[PDB]
């Protein structure tokens, strides 16, 4: 945010380039974290529907307090609005809403399977991501923009 007079176009271009690179590394890292969090969320939802199916866990009746206790005594982590977990035991600590909140639908085998699929897919994402460098992702975005840009030029020439 410090006003600056550039002496060459390539100076500008460079000073952009570096920051961008850094934020591609940063981007990849964040996406990684978020993804891991998602995988944990899904996983625990599955453990929760599964433990209910096998009849190992019962929510029918049993005042929400007694349920919470069971949940945190089974290892279930809490989740805040963002999606960040908590295992320490309000927005700071997260709630079990990610598991009692889910529509009764989930408890039907079909929804269960969909959930599983979603989990697997999430993990696949995570793995594909960790297998890329900043410059890689940046490159992908670049080529995509190449296609999109060609199409754009076509359209622009078309309307004039």
């Amino acid at each position: 945010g410090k006003i600056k007079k550039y002496n060459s176009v390539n100076e500008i271009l460079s000073e952009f380039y570096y920051v961008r690179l850094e934020y591609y590394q940063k981007r990849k890292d964040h996406m990684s974290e978020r993804l891991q969090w998602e995988v944990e969320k899904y996983s625990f939802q599955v453990k929760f529907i599964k433990m209910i199916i096998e009849k190992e866990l019962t929510v029918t009746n049993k005042p929400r307090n007694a349920i919470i206790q069971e949940l945190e005594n089974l290892g279930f982590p809490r989740f805040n609005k963002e999606g960040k977990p908590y295992y320490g035991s309000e927005e700071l600590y997260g709630t079990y809403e990610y598991l009692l909140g889910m529509r009764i639908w989930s408890l039907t085998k079909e929804r269960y399977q969909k959930l599983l699929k979603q989990k697997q897919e999430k993990e696949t994402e995570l793995e594909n991501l960790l297998k890329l460098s900043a410059k890689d992702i940046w490159n992908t975005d670049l080529k995509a923009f190449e296609v999109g840009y060609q199409e754009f030029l076509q359209r622009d020439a078309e309307a004039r």
């Binding site: 945010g1 006003i3 600056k4 550039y6 500008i12 000073e15 952009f16 920051v19």
Partner: protein, 49 residues
């Protein structure tokens, strides 16, 4: 200087950037008239001008 001179990184003056941020907040894949988009953006971007 802030409102007239753009930032080297995106090349935006704060107005423009507020406009785009607004267009991202809303799903602008379907058109709407300018005289509405402007006020919308102004509202959801704290635009005092």
């Amino acid at each position: 200087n802030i409102r007239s001179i753009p930032n080297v990184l995106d090349g935006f003056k704060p107005g423009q950037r507020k406009v785009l941020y607004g267009c991202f907040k809303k799903n602008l894949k379907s058109e709407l008239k300018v005289a509405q988009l402007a006020p919308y953006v102004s509202e959801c971007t704290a635009y005092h001008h």
